[PDB]
Design a protein around this ligand. Sequence first.
Ligand SMILES: Nc1ncnc2c1ncn2[C@@H]1O[C@H](COP(=O)(O)OP(=O)(O)OP(=O)(O)O)[C@@H](O)[C@H]1O
Length: 367
Amino acid sequence: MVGQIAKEMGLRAYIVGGVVRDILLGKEVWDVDFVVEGNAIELAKELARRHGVNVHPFPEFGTAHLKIGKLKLEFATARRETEPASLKEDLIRRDFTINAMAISVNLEDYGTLIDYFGGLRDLKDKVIRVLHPVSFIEDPVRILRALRFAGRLNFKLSRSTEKLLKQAVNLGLLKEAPRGRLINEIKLALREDRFLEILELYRKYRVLEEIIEGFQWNEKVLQKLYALRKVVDWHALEFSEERIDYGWLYLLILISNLDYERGKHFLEEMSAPSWVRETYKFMKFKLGSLKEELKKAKENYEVYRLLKPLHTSVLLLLMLEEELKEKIKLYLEKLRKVKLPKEKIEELKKGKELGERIEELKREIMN
RNA sequence: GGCCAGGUAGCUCAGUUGGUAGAGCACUGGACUGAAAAUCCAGGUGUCGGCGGUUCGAUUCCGCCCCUGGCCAC
Ligand SMILES: Nc1ncnc2c1ncn2[C@@H]1O[C@H](COP(=O)(O)OP(=O)(O)OP(=O)(O)O)[C@@H](O)[C@H]1O
């Protein structure tokens, strides 16, 4: 219906950005980005009116947001910078060639993909390529983004883009960049399933040393990341109904050797979840003694008492130890699963004494 | 859209090793009164946001959503 309203208004609208990429990658998303030559606001208002839904105009930015069903629509006016601006000027201000393309929703040319910079070629060649040599200088945040994309799509940086990125990092532009944008970029990074690869790229180009103060790479941490990779794989395989956010675990492994002050500060900047902060504060201190207690474990009930109050993340961190692995697993798929019939429990009930008695019965069943 | 709080009676507010809930003023009834108020005895003062899951048992553990306020990414 967009092309029709655009025809009535005598305008030109286009699907633009990653939305196109995902479309070309076969990935269907509910968030669509539009670039409109002429006023996008009235277009969004009319489209919202015909479908009979609310509209959220933003005149100063020149963009408008409206929601139809599960579809989240954003209409943006064509702008050459971050006289009417052409679509090409609006695309050339973007980061990478794969994100620089567009698909015309105009009724006459409808279905046609508009690619000026050959982003389609780079898409088929699995290449992350910047539009201009000053790209990383303009927006240092992109230094992360590229890597992030290279993590997700499993693409490779072109020689040009790679050299330019390395030069950009060597100038320490990553420190001059706004803290919030970088932190948010890392937040977007850790949400990826391929995030580990993004960490490999972060290690390769050493951006984490720039962003995080006091952070240095070693082998133990990396091996811990791959072990955690295996644990995450298994847990997301069998226990998948119990899934939690995995990236934060890797993030904890990275900051494990860091000082508690810098760790708490970083987690504060990242706006980490409560269970993440708890797992970190537990890891930095009580984790060692916990392991030492798990080493002295003989009966299964002691293992129960030491494990059950803990979260799943802590257990996954306990699976990093080879000796504790099968123990944790045994606690998972067997130990904590059990029940009791009616008459028996009725005999058990005859305050806290009922609970203590139940515990005595459980440790009576286990051992 | 991300996060942090806040959600407790009509209103204003505390509450952690899960184990049988609270304050200050409105609410009902009776004693009291010509009527009313005060006051006394008392006692509602509540599925402690909503829906699932774990647990013998969840205001608490978790997950998904509702509401309000504040930091922002926009
Ligand atoms: N710092 C930047 N510089 C230039 N162009 C950018 C920048 N950030 C975003 N863009 C462009 O604007 C679009 C905004 O899309 P969005 O913010 O959703 O990111 P994305 O690439 O779609 O990934 P995701 O959907 O995971 O956020 C992107 O497709 C990108 O082409």
